[PDB]
Short mmCIF file of C-alpha atoms and ligand atoms in Angstrom, two decimals:
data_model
loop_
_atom_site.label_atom_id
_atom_site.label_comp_id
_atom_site.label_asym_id
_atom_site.label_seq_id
_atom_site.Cartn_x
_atom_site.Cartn_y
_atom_site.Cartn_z
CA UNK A 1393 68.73 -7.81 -22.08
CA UNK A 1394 69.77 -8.85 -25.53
CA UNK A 1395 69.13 -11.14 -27.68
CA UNK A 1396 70.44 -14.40 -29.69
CA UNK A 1397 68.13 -15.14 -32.76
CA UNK A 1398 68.94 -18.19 -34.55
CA UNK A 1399 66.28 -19.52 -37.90
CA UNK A 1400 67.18 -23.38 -38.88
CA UNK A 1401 66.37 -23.28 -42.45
CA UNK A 1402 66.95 -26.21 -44.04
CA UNK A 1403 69.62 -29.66 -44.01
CA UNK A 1404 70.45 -31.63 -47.74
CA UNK A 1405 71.67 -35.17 -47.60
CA UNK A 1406 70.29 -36.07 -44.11
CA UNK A 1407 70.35 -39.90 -44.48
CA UNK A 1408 69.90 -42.14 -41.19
CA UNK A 1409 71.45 -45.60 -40.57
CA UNK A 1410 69.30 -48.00 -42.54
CA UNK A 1411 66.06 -48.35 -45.00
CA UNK A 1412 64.14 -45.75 -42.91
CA UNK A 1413 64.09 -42.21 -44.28
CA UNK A 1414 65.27 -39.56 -42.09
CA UNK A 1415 62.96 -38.09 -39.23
CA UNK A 1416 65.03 -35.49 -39.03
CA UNK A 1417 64.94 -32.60 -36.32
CA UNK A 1418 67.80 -30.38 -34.72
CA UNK A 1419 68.57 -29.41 -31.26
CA UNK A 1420 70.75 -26.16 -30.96
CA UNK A 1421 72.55 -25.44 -27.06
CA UNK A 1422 74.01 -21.80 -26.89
CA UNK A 1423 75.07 -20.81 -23.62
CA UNK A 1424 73.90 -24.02 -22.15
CA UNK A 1425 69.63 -23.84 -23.06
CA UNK A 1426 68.90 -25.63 -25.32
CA UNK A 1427 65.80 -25.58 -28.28
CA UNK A 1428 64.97 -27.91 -30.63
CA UNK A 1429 63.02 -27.81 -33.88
CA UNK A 1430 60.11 -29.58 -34.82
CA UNK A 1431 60.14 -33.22 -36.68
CA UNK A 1432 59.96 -33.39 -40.84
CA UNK A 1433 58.39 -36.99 -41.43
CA UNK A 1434 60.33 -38.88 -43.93
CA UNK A 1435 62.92 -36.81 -45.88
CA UNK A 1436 66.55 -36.89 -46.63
CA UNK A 1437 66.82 -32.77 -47.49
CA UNK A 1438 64.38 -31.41 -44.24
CA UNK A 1439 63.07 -27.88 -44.21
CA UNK A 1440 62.46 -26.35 -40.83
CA UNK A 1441 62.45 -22.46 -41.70
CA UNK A 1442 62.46 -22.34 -37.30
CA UNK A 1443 63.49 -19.27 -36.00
CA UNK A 1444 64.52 -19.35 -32.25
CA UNK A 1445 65.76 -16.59 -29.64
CA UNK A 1446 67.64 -17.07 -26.93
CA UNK A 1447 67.14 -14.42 -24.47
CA UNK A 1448 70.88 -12.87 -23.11
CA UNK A 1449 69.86 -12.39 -19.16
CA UNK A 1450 72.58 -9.63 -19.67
CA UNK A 1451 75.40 -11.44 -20.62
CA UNK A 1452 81.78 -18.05 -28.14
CA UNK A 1453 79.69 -21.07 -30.75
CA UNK A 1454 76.65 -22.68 -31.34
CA UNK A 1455 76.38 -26.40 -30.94
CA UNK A 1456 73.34 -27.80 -33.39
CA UNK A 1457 72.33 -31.78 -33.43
CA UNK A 1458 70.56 -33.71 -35.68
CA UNK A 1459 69.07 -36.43 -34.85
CA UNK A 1460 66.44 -38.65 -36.34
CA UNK A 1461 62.92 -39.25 -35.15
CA UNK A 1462 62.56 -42.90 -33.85
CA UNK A 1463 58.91 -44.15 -33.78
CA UNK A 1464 57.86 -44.10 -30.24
CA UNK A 1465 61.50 -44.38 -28.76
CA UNK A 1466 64.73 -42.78 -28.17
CA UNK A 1467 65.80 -40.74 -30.88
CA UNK A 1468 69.50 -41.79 -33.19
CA UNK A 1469 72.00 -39.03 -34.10
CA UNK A 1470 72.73 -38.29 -37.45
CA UNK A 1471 75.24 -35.36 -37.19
CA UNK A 1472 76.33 -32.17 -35.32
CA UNK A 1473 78.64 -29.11 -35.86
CA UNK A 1474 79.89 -26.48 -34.21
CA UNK A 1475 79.52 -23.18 -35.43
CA UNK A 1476 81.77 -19.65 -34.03
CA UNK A 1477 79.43 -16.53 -33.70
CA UNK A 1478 82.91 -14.83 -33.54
CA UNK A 1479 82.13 -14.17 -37.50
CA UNK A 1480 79.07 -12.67 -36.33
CA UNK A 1481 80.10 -9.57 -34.71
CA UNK A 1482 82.63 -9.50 -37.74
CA UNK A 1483 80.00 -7.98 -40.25
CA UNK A 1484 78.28 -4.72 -39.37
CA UNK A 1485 75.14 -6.33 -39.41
CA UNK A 1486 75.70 -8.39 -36.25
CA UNK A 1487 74.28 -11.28 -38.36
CA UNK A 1488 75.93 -13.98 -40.63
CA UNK A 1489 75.16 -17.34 -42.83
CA UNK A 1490 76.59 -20.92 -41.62
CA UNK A 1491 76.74 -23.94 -44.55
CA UNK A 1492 77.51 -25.94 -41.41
CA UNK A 1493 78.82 -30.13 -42.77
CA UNK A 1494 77.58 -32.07 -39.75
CA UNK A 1495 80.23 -34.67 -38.18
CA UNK A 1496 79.71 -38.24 -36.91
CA UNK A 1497 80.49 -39.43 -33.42
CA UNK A 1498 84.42 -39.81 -34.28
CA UNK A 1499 84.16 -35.84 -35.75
CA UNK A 1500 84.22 -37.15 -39.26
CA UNK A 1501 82.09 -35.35 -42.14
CA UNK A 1502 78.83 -37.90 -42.33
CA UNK A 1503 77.90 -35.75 -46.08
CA UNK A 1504 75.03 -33.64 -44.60
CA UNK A 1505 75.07 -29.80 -44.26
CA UNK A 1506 72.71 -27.82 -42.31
CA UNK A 1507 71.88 -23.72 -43.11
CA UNK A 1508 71.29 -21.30 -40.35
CA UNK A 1509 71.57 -17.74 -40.30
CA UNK A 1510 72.30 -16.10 -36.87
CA UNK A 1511 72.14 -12.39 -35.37
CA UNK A 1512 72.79 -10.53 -32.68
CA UNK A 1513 70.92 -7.52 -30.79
CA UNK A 1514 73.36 -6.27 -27.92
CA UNK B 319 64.33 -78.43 -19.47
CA UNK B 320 67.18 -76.42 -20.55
CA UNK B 321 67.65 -73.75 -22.90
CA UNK B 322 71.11 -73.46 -24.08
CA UNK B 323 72.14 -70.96 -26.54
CA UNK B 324 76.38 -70.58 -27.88
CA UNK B 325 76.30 -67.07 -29.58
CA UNK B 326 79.31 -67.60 -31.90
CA UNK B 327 79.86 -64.64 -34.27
CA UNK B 328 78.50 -61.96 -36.13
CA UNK B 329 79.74 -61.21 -39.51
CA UNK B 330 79.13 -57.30 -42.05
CA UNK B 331 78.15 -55.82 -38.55
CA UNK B 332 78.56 -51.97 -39.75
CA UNK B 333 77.92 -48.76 -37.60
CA UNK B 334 76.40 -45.53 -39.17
CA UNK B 335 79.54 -43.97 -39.19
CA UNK B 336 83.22 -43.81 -39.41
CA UNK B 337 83.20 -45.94 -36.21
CA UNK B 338 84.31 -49.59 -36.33
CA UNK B 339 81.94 -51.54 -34.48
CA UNK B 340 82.65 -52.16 -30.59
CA UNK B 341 79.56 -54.81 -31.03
CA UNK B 342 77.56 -56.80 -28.43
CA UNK B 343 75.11 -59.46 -28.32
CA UNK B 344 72.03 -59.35 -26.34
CA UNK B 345 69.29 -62.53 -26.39
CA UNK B 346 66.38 -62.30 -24.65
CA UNK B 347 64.04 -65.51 -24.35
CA UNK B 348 60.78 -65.43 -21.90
CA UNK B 349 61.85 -62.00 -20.89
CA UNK B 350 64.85 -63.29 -19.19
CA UNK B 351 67.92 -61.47 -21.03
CA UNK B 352 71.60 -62.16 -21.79
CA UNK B 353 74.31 -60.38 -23.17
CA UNK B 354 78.00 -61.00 -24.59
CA UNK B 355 80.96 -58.88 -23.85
CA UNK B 356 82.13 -56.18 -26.03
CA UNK B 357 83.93 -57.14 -29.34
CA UNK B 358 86.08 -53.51 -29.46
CA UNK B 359 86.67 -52.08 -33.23
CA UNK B 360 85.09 -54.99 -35.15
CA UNK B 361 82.90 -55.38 -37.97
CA UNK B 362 82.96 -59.39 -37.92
CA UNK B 363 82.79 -59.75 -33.94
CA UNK B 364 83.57 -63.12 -32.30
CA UNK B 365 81.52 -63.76 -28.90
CA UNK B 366 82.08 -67.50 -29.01
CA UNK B 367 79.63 -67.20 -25.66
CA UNK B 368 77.15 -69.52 -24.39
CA UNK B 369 74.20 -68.90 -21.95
CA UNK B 370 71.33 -71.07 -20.35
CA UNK B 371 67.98 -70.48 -19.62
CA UNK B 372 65.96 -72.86 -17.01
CA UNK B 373 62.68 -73.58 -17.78
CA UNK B 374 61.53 -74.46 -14.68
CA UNK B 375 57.71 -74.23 -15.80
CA UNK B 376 57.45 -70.59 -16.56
CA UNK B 377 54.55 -70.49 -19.23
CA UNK B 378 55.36 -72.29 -22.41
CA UNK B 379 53.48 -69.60 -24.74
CA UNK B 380 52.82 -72.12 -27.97
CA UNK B 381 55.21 -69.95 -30.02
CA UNK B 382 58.07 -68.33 -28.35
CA UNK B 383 61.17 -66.93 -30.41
CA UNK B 384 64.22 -65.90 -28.90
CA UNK B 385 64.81 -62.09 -29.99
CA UNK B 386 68.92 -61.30 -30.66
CA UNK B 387 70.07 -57.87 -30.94
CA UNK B 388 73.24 -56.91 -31.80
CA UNK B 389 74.60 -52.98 -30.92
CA UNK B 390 77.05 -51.03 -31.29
CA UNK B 391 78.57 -49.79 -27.85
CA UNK B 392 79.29 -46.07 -27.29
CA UNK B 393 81.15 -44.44 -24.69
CA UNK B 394 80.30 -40.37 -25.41
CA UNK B 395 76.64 -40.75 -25.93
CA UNK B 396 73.74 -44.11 -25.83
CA UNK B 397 74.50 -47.46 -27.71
CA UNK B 398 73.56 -47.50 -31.31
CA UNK B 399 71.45 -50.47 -32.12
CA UNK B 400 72.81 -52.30 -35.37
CA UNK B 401 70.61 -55.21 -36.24
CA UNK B 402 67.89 -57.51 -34.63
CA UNK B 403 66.41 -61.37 -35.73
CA UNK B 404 63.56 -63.52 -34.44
CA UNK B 405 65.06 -66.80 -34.22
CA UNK B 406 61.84 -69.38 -34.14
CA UNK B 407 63.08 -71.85 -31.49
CA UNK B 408 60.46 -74.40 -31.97
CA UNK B 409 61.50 -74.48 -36.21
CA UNK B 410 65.21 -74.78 -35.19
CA UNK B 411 65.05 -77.32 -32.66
CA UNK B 412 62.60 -79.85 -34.00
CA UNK B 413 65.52 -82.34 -35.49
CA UNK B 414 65.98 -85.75 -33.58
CA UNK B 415 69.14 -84.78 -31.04
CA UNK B 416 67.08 -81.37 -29.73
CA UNK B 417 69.75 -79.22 -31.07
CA UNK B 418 70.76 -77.18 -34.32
CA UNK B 419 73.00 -74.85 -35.98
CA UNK B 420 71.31 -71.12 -36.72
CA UNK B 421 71.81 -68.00 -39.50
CA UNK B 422 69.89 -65.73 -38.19
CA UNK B 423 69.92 -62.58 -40.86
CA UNK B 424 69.71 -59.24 -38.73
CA UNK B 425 67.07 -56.96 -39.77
CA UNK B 426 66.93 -52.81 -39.30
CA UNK B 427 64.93 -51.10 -37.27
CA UNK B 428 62.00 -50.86 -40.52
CA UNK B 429 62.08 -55.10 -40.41
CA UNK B 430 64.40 -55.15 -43.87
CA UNK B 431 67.89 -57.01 -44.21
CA UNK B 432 70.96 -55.29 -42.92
CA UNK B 433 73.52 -57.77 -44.84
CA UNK B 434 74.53 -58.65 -41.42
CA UNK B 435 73.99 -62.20 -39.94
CA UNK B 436 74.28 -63.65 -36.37
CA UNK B 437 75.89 -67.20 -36.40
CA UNK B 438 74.76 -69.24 -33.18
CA UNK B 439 73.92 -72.92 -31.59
CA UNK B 440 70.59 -73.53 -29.99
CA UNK B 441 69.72 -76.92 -28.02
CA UNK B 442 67.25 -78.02 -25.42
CA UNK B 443 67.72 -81.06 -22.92
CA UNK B 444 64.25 -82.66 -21.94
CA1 CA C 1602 60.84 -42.26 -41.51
CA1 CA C 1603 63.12 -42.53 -37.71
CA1 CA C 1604 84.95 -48.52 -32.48
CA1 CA C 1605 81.08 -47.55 -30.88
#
């Protein structure tokens, strides 16, 4: 009963903490489910082109983390960012584009940017 | 025989991010592990702790390094490992009074140089 669809396109600048080059994936929580794209082996500017939809049982931002792949192992963040849909009932297209800079853990710009576009069927 | 190890210092210990290190020392040696307390907003942490391990004839595998890891401790999501060395016991202590001073340069998490090195004393008592 409505519908939240959200495509990950693409990140620039995605570098992890040491020699290794970025595994890098991103997992989006609206409304408290979460999805998560798949895994680009070994690049510092990732495209995903992933296009999720998060069904609206009838029923505001969207909360997207990268993190980077770890070999067998538990996965290192990168960067996150919050982004308000309130700019996307703004438009008449119930749809908008987010440049989004991801933070670090102390909310700090880490350099990277990740670009979503989001829309919304009522 | 016993296994004494005095983790002194770490020094160019860097997180990924804007955070200043709140590093710790773990040492693990036969799969029995240690660990320092926290050095809180510190790139050049000082432990200056020293543990003991007790032979006691568990299996003397021929070669049998002492792996250090050094991480960064978190309190909003999991600890962020920072760097890691295989210190070769057997290399460090074969010098006539059983004990020796140790550099051990911390590698990354591909096995290449951080900048960062672990300072620490290793000696065993027959
Ligand atoms: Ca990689
Ligand atoms: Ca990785
Ligand atoms: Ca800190
Ligand atoms: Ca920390």
């Amino acid at each position: 009963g409505g519908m939240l669809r959200v495509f990950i396109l693409y990140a620039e600048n995605v570098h992890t903490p040491d020699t290794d080059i970025s595994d890098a994936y991103c997992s989006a929580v609206f409304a408290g489910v979460k999805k998560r794209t798949k895994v680009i082996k070994n690049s510092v500017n990732p495209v995903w082109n992933e296009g999720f939809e998060w069904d609206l049982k009838g029923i505001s931002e969207l909360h997207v983390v990268v993190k980077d792949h770890e070999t067998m192992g538990r996965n290192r963040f990168l960067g996150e960012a919050k982004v308000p849909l309130r700019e996307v009932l703004a438009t008449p297209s119930l749809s908008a584009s987010f440049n989004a800079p991801l933070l670090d853990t102390k909310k700090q710009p880490t350099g990277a940017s990740l670009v979503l576009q989001v829309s919304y069927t009522p």
